């Protein structure tokens, strides 16, 4: 299947309470593998998955050096934007950044990303051609001009198509037991009478990986999207995910409903019925 590597950075100012807090996390598909917190004691990039713990001191010293450089810069970025938007020094603001690469089933480069958001709003982003930038406001355009003059897109492109994919492939092979695997969902249904003529049927999908999944309810074979309560896919905390979908059924019509489950770990789509 396809794969991806992504780094997420969050910088938050706190006027009158020291310098901004900076948090960095790295992911391969839906598995986190590293982190850095500017408020933590170690002041080092740290492992968050067993397969990356085997990397030597050269790796950890190198990622620590680079991550602190990211921190210092994104700490300063908050000051730069406050100026661009002429905002007061009293308020707390947020800068977010994300970059990474996607690889196809053949493990070759598919797409690359590098974008920012200020206080939850898109600020600047590299376009799909990996050569131009998207800037929504005047401020963003100032950054856009600086980056065009410094030929940032070109340097970035070399990372996205080369370095990024090379490391992703390495991680996929070193942690193949967990990254190249799939945990099919374990399923079941629950039935609960809400009254004397209506009951709730809930379809469960548990302990699955990756997170991508499709859960649906049908009545006589027709979709019941508007009558189905579907919760967001959630982390179990052990590396797997969970999700459920429910529909309220008139007592006596249970047999008309079917739950359908689609997941990469299933040899074939599942069709469940309460009976």
């Amino acid at each position: 299947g396809s794969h991806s590597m992504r780094y997420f950075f969050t910088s938050v100012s706190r006027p009158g309470r020291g310098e901004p807090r900076f948090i960095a996390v790295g992911y391969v598909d839906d598995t986190q593998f590293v982190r850095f917190d500017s408020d933590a004691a170690s002041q080092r990039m740290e492992p968050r998955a067993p397969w990356i713990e085997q990397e030597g001191p050269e790796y950890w010293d190198g990622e620590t050096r680079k991550v602190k450089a990211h921190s210092q810069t994104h700490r300063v970025d908050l000051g730069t934007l406050r100026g661009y938007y002429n905002q007061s020094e009293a308020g707390s603001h947020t800068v977010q950044r994300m970059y990474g690469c996607d690889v196809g089933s053949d493990w070759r480069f598919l797409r690359g990303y590098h974008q920012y958001a200020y206080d939850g709003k898109d600020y600047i982003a590299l376009k799909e051609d990996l050569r131009s930038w998207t800037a929504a406001d005047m401020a963003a355009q100032t950054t856009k001009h600086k980056w065009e003059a410094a030929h940032v897109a070109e340097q970035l492109r070399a990372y996205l198509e080369g370095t990024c994919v090379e490391w992703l492939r390495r991680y996929l092979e070193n942690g193949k037991e967990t990254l190249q695997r799939t945990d099919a969902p374990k399923t079941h249904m629950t039935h609960h009478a809400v009254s004397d003529h209506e009951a709730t049927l809930r379809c469960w999908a548990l302990s699955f990986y990756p997170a991508e999944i499709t859960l649906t309810w049908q009545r006589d074979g027709e979709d019941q999207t508007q009558d189905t309560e579907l919760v967001e896919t959630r982390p179990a905390g052990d590396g797997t995910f969970q999700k459920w979908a429910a529909v309220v059924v008139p007592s006596g019509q249970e047999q008309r409903y079917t739950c359908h489950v689609q997941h990469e770990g299933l040899p074939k789509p599942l069709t469940l019925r309460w009976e």
Binding site: Y7, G26, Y59, G62, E63, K66, V67, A69, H70, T73, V76, D77, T80, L81, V95, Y99, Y116, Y123, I124, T143, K146, W147, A150, V152, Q155, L156, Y159, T163, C164, W167
Partner: peptide, 9 residues
């Protein structure tokens, strides 16, 4: 691994 060059806004 991280990108070694860090652009500035």
């Amino acid at each position: 691994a991280l990108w070694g060059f860090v652009p500035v806004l």
